[PDB]
């Protein structure tokens, strides 16, 4: 009686896409045909299979579809996913993406001299591809289809444009891409490195404190540098740097160490008007010369935010909708001004008399009890750090809105995860909680749930519900497949007519999904020495290697590949746009990155773009 089709709200070409087809209130076995056609003309059948839906399977099927990029090329593209069978005809138009997976470029260095080869690899998270080089002026100078097994070095000419070059890797027809950068400069490697340590990671916009940078200068072979440093402070306003000329200071570097100081008085004389500072950063340019004058290194301490508080409160990890008469889980996210998580910070919502202290991931979950009658929910949170005056505490407000029930039924679903700092290997209790009409609720026999990861449906399941149980608990085993995060979407249906849905966004500890370690003896070596290292990793791993002079990083360290860049890039591409729940049943699917259609014509609205709004 109720037939439903759920897909990702965006489908990728050339990759396994699970979809979910269900029959509720129907225990008759069926052969279902699954089609995918190009939209709107349906010129061709992009994909086709057939599935068996039977009682033994909960009258639920999860066919995998796959859309070949080569069948649907040429310039937003859509496809229509169609399910047909006895008494069954569902159809859904879905946005297509040409980004079949996530690509990442590794180059051998971040900086090159004229007349030298740029060596690069392209990695894909799931194993074709176009690679392009552009000059600093933005001119395309190389364009090649590459096999992900063999890459062609780009040989820089001797008469070559200086500045920041780009390598771009993309699937053909994809407006998305991965861009990496490298500098081309006339440089020689310095013989030593300069490390900078600010007195604080921030600078109070209206504070009284001075600011210091401690300088450590060490030769790359490990010994201390003696010399002199010239330090100039300034404020970076967007792109332009406005220096504080009277802050220019010359200080001795003795036994590798020195300390430069910006006096508050000097700062104020130059920047008396607080308005000019809001949103901007302090920087310190540090130029170190060895005592003999044989060598010099120029680096900069940047990104010292000029702020009124050491913390920031964010609500980006908490749902903007609540269920009246059910406890609302408020996830508070506190960061430092640079956006790293702030651990061990007390927070409080005074109006609710709720307190918590953030964990290593910077989050604290507070439970707010919500009266049955509330339709709007103003919330204000502030830090409550014992060492700060109230004026330095960070604060932030939001308003959550009540989930609108289908037809005013008053039926709700709330999925609760109490666990924190979740890591692969963990066993996570998931609570299904229902609220509403007694006669409606007795009709509930099961919850359907989907685990969404990196834009896909990763797993679908059924959770039984014995009548009487307004609380039903399930164990979820966390595997490396759920890194860097996942969504838990769930719903029940009543009377083959009403769908009630919820979802939660669950962060997972970011690590490699597998394992890779380089082990050595850690002894100091002589030039030309015989080395042995062990590479430890997963069976069948293909390992790309490189050895880089640490001196290279002294000149440039901004562009290197890393795991955090990998996970961050993936998160920025999430098809779901919110931290959970929704304005109504359809809102829950849409906001989580799912499309829904039903035999009763309950349909999620068309999605604008693959990219979640700013």
């Amino acid at each position: 009686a109720l037939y439903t089709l759920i897909t990702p709200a965006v489908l990728r070409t050339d990759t396994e896409e699970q979809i979910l087809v269900e029959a509720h209130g129907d225990s008759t076995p069926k052969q279902l045909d699954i089609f995918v056609h190009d939209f709107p003309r349906k010129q061709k059948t992009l994909f086709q299979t057939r599935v068996d839906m039977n009682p033994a399977g909960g009258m639920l099927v999860t066919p995998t579809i796959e859309i070949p990029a080569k069948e649907v090329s040429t310039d937003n593209q859509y496809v229509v996913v169609q399910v047909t069978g006895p008494q069954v005809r569902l159809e859904k138009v879905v946005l297509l993406s040409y980004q079949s997976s996530f690509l990442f470029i590794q180059t051998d260095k971040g900086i090159y001299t004229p007349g030298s080869p740029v060596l690069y690899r392209v990695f894909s998270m799931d194993h074709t591809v176009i690679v392009e080089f552009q000059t600093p002026e933005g001119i395309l100078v190389s364009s090649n289809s590459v096999d992900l097994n063999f890459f062609w070095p780009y040989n820089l000419p001797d008469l070559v444009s200086l500045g920041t070059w780009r390598i771009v890797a993309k699937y053909e027809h994809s407006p998305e891409n991965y861009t990496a950068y490298f500098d081309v400069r006339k440089y020689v490697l310095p013989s030593f490195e300069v490390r900078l340590q600010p007195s604080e990671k921030f600078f109070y916009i209206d504070g009284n404190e001075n600011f210091h940078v401690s300088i450590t200068a060490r030769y790359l072979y490990g010994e201390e540098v003696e010399g002199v440093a010239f330090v100039l402070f300034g404020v970076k306003i967007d792109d332009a740097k406005k220096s504080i000329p009277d802050s220019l200071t010359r200080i001795p570097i003795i036994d590798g160490d020195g300390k430069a100081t910006l006096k508050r008085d000097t700062f104020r004389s130059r920047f008396p008007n607080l308005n000019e500072l809001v949103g901007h950063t302090l920087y310190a340019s540090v130029t170190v010369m060895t005592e003999s004058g044989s060598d010099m290194v120029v680096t900069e301490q940047s990104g010292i935010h000029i702020v009124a508080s050491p913390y920031q409160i964010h609500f980006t990890k908490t749902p903007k909708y609540f269920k009246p008469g059910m406890p609302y889980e408020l996830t508070v996210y506190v960061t430092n001004p640079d956006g790293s998580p702030a651990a061990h910070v007390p927070v409080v919502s005074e109006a609710f008399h709720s307190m918590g202290t953030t964990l290593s991931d910077g989050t604290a979950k507070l439970i707010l009890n919500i009266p049955l009658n509330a339709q709007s929910l103003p919330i204000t949170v502030r830090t409550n750090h014992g060492d700060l005056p109230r004026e330095r505490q960070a604060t932030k407000s939001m308003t959550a809105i009540a989930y609108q029930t289908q037809g005013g039924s008053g039926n709700y679903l709330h999925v609760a995860i109490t666990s924190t700092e979740i890591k692969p290997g963990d066993n996570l209790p998931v609570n299904f909680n229902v609220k509403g009409n007694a006669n409606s609720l007795k009709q509930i026999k099961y919850f359907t749930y989907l685990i969404l990861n990196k834009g896909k449906i990763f797993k679908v399941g059924r959770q039984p519900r014995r009548d009487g149980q307004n609380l039903v608990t399930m164990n979820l085993h966390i595997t490396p497949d759920l890194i860097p995060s996942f969504r838990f979407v769930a719903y029940y249906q009543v009377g083959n007519n009403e769908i009630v849905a919820d979802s939660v966004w669950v962060d997972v500890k970011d690590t490699c999904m597998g394992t890779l370690v380089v082990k050595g003896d850690n002894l100091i070596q002589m030039p030309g020495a015989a080395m042995k290292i062990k590479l430890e990793g997963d069976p069948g791993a293909r390992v790309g290697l490189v050895a880089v002079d640490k001196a290279v990083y002294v000149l440039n360290d901004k562009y290197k590949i890393s795991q955090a860049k990998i996970w961050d890039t993936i998160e920025k591409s999430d098809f779901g746009c919110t931290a959970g729940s929704g304005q109504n049943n359809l809102g829950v699917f849409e906001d989580a990155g799912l499309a829904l259609t039903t035999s009763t014509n309950l349909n999620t609205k068309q999605r604008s773009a693959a990219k979640c709004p700013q």
Binding site: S143, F230, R250, P252, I254, T287, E291, S292, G293, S294
Partner: protein
Amino acid sequence: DLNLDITIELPDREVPIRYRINYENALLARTVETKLNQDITVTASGDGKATMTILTFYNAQLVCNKFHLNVSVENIHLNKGALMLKICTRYLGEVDSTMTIIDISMLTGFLPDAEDLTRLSKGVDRYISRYEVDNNMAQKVAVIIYLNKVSHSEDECLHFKILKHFEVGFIQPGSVKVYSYYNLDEKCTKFYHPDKGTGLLNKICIGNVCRCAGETCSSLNHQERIDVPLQIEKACETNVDYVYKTKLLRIEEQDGNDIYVMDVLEVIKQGTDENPRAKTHQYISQRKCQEALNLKVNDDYLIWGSRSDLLPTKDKISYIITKNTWIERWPHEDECQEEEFQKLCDDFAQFSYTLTEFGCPT
């Protein structure tokens, strides 16, 4: 749509280069390179448009840009072989240059006088980094003086003694650099040396081609008798290209070099130059070697040398005098009657006779 056929014909190769430019590859710039400067013929057929840029790179005839700098070094008396180093500098901008640096390297084997350096390091406007002292010498071969500023209106001068730490065969020039915090771009450097007005190593340039002239001087060979077999062997080393008897016609000067103009009187051993007697030969030396070479106009010389020492002088034969060059005074015809030169003359005649008649021995 866009559909361009491009043909490039270069003289440096028979097979022209051909591109098609269409919508699909329009963004891609195509480059061709030639090391010549010759006519280029380009053809374009079809629908689209393109921009062709021809870049010709070359070196054109054209540092101490933002500072003036004078350096001199002098002898002084200490009662030692002490020297006095003097440095004057001024900034060429419109205000004083902040955080200026005077960067000094010592002559080989010299170190700063410790008392003078300490005297210099005083003042609320300067800084000189830490140095140990031994035997009244600051243990720094490179000495940096940091100034809070240098004047743009008037020269700022300083001086200090440098003392001999150790001896060497030859003393390399020292140098002084000046730059400042906001002008670390500045290439401003002068050399100094107790025996050279400008601290420059001796070289000899013909246009843009320079040769190292050596810091050591060659000297006229003198021998009261010639061991003829031995002399023959020396003349017959594979690196000895020619052996001549010459007369010195003139001594000319230019760019601190002596040009000894030689007429080749006799080819004793024929070298690479096929007709040396036809053209006059310039033998070039630094004036530092004047005294030691002690050549006299109208005197005759035995000269042999290496082909390596030929200079790229157009329309004259010129050699650099080097340690491979053998020069010896050849007594005049009338001198051959004095008992002073009698037997030496016999030796020269026998040397000449053996070589011209029989050649080298091996």
